[PDB]
Amino acid sequence: RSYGFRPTYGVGHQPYRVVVLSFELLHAPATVCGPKKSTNLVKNKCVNF
Amino acid sequence: RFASVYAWNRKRISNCVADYSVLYNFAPFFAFKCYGVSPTKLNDLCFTN
Amino acid sequence: VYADSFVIRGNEVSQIAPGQTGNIADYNYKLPDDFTGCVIAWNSNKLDS
Amino acid sequence: LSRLDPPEAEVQIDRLITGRLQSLQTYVTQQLIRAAEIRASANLAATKM
């Protein structure tokens, strides 16, 4: 069945468009990440990582 | 002509089949807030009135 | 990540959500119960009528 | 479960699960205390015999 769209129709019957971005998180090799600068490495000292 | 708030009408319905997915054509709206019952499941429930 | 878009009627904007049933979602497009994304819905009458 | 859809049915039944777990915990704690009480009388009876 096909829709019939006309400007006479008000809200509810007025056509809508839906855009979906769907992530997925997993403990797998990450390939997408945001614009954040990397840093160097330190060893044997209590640090944040 | 819809009745004013100070005098509203009411109809009590009984002794008939309960089909509820057909009302989408005879009344324009946007929400269909069926808080109590899932709309698609009304085909099976038996109601008092 | 996945990106997609499609056009529907405005009566069922809330029908694209986990656990939503009905002919407009059961046989057209239904989300999984554990969806996690950025759903965007726009009233497209200037460009889709 | 036959009255509502899963997305809020699970919200409704979470409280039932928590309440029944609390009741079972109370029952087992009371039984443990009563058993500890009975053991002393059993030991006294053994000594008397």
Add this chain to the structure above:
Amino acid sequence: LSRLDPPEAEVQIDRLITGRLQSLQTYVTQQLIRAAEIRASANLAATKM
């Protein structure tokens, strides 16, 4: 905490707080009962000695 904003992050973590508190309470109650059990055997050993 790094995944969601505070207003619903606190809602999410409230359940964790409650569950962990319940677990700790169960642990300490069991330890109290076991200690009460052990004390009787200690007293019996003292009398035998």
